[PDB]
Structure 1
Amino acid sequence: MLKKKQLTVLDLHPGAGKTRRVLPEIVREAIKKRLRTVILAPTRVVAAEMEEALRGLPVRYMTTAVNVTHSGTEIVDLMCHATFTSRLLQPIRVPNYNLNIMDEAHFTDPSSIAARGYISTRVEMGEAAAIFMTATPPGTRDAFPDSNSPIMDTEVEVPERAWSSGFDWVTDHSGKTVWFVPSVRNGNEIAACLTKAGKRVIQLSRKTFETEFQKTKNQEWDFVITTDISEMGANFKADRVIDSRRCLKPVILDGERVILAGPMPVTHASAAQRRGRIGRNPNKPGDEYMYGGGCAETDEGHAHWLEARMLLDNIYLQDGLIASLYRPEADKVAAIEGEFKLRTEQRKTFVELMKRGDLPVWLAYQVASAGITYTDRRWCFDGTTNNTIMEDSVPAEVWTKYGEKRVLKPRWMDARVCSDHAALKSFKEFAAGKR
């Protein structure tokens, strides 16, 4: 697989040993052939598990998740998918890796889609080799792949709100359950219902993942309530997965706003990855998978793919050439290559609104493309009356950097800045000039 010009998809079933067995062998072969290599982890939690599997091999860990003193003689770098894309965007030269390995290559966050598009383009050009590691490559239609041990698959009605009766099977279980919910707010209601029933519940989401995932190892628990982030390599010692089979879909309406549509069905890849959390121990047959809906290709028209085109249009590749999306996922968005290419100063603003501002890609692009500078926050208050952001059914208010109390009313409305309490608190700090 290491020969130039080729992209290999390593699609072994979940738990087949892609990370702990195949990855170290690939790395040893790459170091033997003197290939400058990058290893891309979806999260800092996966990067730490990779360090355990790669111990004894010269790897440069470009992440604060690992505490290792580097020798300086490493030709293999390890970083998360988002750091790879961010460094490509920033005015820092990234080496032209001869071998690019992406673990959990099914990750649908805009930065992972951009990384696959950039790497696959370099491979098409004949400059590099790549290995995409995932049980569920783009376009997979099988939500029931193979496993290390047999799984009991049961289609059943799964509660998406607090319940008082009709779901005895949920609480009458004596093992550990991983339950996938469509959103943080939906998880809060179910966790509260399970806590009132006497269950020990841990909740996981993108922002709290690294911190709260440690609790799954450090303390006894009955249920883990998680968004889709746990589809990316998160391992549990559990015997059941309850799957709502639903997710939220960011959708761009009329090219002027982003809504969080749904909950709606997950893709086959997401369902197979959610189910993939169990049936991993060959000595423990009969782990359960309870699913409450069907699958659909909800990645079509999903804003993450349009956002990946905004990132790819602003990454230098060669003169005016622009990287295409990875072919199997390239029809998910109606987009013309280069339509989002920004001039030098506007691109620097676009990068800073994402990196320091913490804004979603689409929103950062609207602000940068309008000729607004990073610290100018007047756009957070000059939108139409229908863009008024609501908190507890009352308009959200902030003291501007001038000392004036104003209602948060952004010129461009992106529902992701207020998807939960923590998101809106962060956006209010942004509108106030606090970062």
Structure 2
Amino acid sequence: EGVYRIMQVGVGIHMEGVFHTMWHVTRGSVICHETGRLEPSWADVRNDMISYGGGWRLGDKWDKEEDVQVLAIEPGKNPKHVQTKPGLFKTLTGEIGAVTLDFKPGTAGSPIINKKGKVIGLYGNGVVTKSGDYVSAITQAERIGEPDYEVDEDIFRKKRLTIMDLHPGAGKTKRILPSIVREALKRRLRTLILAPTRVVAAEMEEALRGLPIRYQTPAVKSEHTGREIVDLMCHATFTTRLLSSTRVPNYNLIVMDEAHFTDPCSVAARGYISTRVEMGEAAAIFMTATPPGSIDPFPQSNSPIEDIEREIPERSWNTGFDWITDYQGKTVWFVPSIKAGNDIANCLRKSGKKVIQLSRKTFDTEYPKTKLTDWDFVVTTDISEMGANFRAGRVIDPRRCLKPVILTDGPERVILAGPIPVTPASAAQRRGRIGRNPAQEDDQYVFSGDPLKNDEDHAHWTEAKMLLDNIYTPEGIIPTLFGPEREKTQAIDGEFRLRGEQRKTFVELMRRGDLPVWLSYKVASAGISYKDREWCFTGERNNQILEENMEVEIWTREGEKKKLRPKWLDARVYADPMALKDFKEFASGRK
């Protein structure tokens, strides 16, 4: 591994298991060699260069007196070393040396030697003097990259939790997670990997090809094999197994991906995992760019982001916002709801734009379209904040969302407050969809408004508590919320504990009935059987559910016409058509 001939259009150096060359040659693609290993890792354009494989690996500069010679591995010819006295190209940022050698287009990327020793710079970029003859600047990366990663050790110590935080570069899935799993298998650990969504879990399987990875489905309450494998499952799958199985594996290493997920199941999962760590029975790793103890809406990125603040349409527009459609790249747009999404998406197609819409229940079947199809826009709810990757150049983020809130004033009900501003963490994740890939145009994060920090009225913290104290363990131990997220609720521990058949109904209401946690709890803690659906009709006048401006009526399981009017009103069962369709299927006694 010394030097090569990029095909010739350019030349590279093969040091450090990384490949050093320039952006203007071969753009930003792959070089085909045996056993592969070729893909963009870092790029710069002021200093024309695309070091890939690793960050960088070229040390020392040429000073100001040392003579520097250039290799001449040119197309059709042999390598011809040529000694020169380096000149000086004075710029605004600083004067860098510039050698004057006569070479033909295609030899760009040849190494220059530090008088005696290794490479001191990269030849193949300069300007022509109309009066003079030839010139090329001594362009060199300064300073170096990271370059690669190796795993720390108390990461695997029992009774230690490790929050591994960094921006959407960054390799937490493609290079870091497999490095951890591989090190885990060497130490023969019962390892659990948790993903937020099934599609993200799919991205882990491909990233973990060659490793004993077994994806675990929620249709199974537990699965044990004498063979030593690694369990891969969704956060919610982990929680439901904790609620439905006694045979709970005592994993000694648990790795949660996207540990910022505020879904009631994810929070509860963090609550349980944290507790197992306190028992000195497991090691935990929480991977997320925005841990609960952070509020930076504009985190770092591995490519320059143009943060633009301007007015953004909340609904259908007709004139004014020419910048939205005049943009000729791919755009990801975050909307607070599916209703808002449709209103936005419909106006976009009128302008002749290919639009794909995304939501929680349509994520698995629409997200693959964002890869196969050529598209102009992607309208999404806050679901894309968790591991959703796009090949876009711009994000339009109104920073608005819907927030489930449990109203205590009077009869308890769950409303979907909003559109209210998102959390500082959420804004960072929406932004982090871009600035991942080095492009000639820096990515644009177009946003509006400021994020709000306080989300202690969010129903999910209470819902996560309801899930937690219904998880039984080798006691006397009560599972509580994960440290930072503990102050989000004033609920006393164990106050949501149910017993036997009530606890059983509670789980089935969620799993078989597809009901929200709060709604499932109210019914189950009321003593109502699962198959009994009479509470769906014995509600107050104001608890009448509407569907496209008309009062919903349901044909019961016996063949009777009743108005959909639940005793407890959770706004999330009739928020969108797909949610309402499912709940009507439940109230009918069809599932």
TM-score bracket relative to the smaller structure: over 0.9
User: C-alpha separation between the residues in 2 aligned to 1:196 and 1:141?
Assistant: 38
Match of 1:82 among 209, 228, 236: 236
4+ long deviations beyond 3 Å: none
The answer for the alignment partner of 1:27 in structure 2 is 181
Contact kept in structure 2, 1:149 and 1:285, CA below 8 Å: no
**SS at 2:286 equivalent:** strand
Q: Runs of 5+ in structure 2 lacking a partner?
A: 1-154, 219-223
Q: Deviations over 1:180-209 (max 9, x none)?
A: 000111101000110122111000000000
> Match for residue 379 of structure 1?
535
SS in 2 for 1:132: strand
TM-score by length of 2: 0.71
2:338 to 178, 184, 189: 184
| Matched residue, 1:140 | 294
Aligned residues between the structures? 431
Partner of 1:120: 274
Aligned to 1:249: 403
What does residue range 31-180 of structure 1 map to in structure 2 within 5 Å? 31-63=185-217, 73-180=227-334
Q: Which has the higher helix share?
A: 1
Are the aligned partners of 1:59 and 1:74 in contact in 2 as well (CA < 8 Å)? Answer: no
SS class of match (1:413)? coil
Per the alignment, residue 581 of structure 2 pairs with: 425
AA aligned to 2:243 is L
Q: Tell me the CA shift for residue 400 of structure 1.
A: 0.9
Question: What is the CA–CA distance in structure 2 between the aligned matches of 1:332 and 1:425, rounded to whole Å?
Answer: 32
Q: CA deviation at 1:430?
A: 0.6
Deviations 1:261-318 (CA, angstroms, capped at 9, x unpaired): 0111111110000000000013445100011111112421100010000000100123
Mapped to 1, the partners of 2:462 and 2:440 lie a distance apart of: 42
Once the two structures are superposed, what CA deviation does each residue of 1:23-48 show, in whole Å capped at 9, x if it has no partner? 01110111011110100010111111
Which residue of structure 2 aligns with residue 208 of structure 1?
362
- Aligned-pair RMSD on alpha carbons? 1.5
Is the partner of 1:402 in helix, strand or coil? coil
Say whether the 8 Å CA contact 2:403–2:458 is kept in structure 1.
yes
Which residue is equivalent to 1:281? Answer: 437
- The one-letter amino acid paired with 2:546 is M
Q: Distance in 2 between matches of 1:75 and 1:33?
A: 13
- Report if the CA contact (8 A) 1:85-1:114 is conserved: yes
Q: 1:368 aligns with which of 524, 532, 537?
A: 524
Identify which of structures 1 and 2 has the higher relative contact order when contacts are C-alpha pairs closer than 8 Å and 6+ apart.
Answer: 1
CA contact (8 A) 1:44 1:63 kept: no
Q: Which residue of 1 aligns with 2:479?
A: 323
User: Is residue 302–residue 333 contact of structure 1 (8 Å, CA) maintained in 2?
Assistant: no
Aligned residues with identical type, % of pairs: 72
**Structure 1 unmatched ranges of 5 or more:** 65-69
> Is 2:515 aligned against 1:359?
yes
Partner of 1:268: 424
The answer to whether 1:301 aligns with 2:457 is: yes
Aligned partner (choices 480, 485, 499) of residue 343 of structure 1: 499
2:295–2:453 CA contact under 8 A, matched in 1: no
My pick for the range that moved more, 176-185 or 83-92, is 83-92
Q: Structure 1-normalised TM-score?
A: 0.97
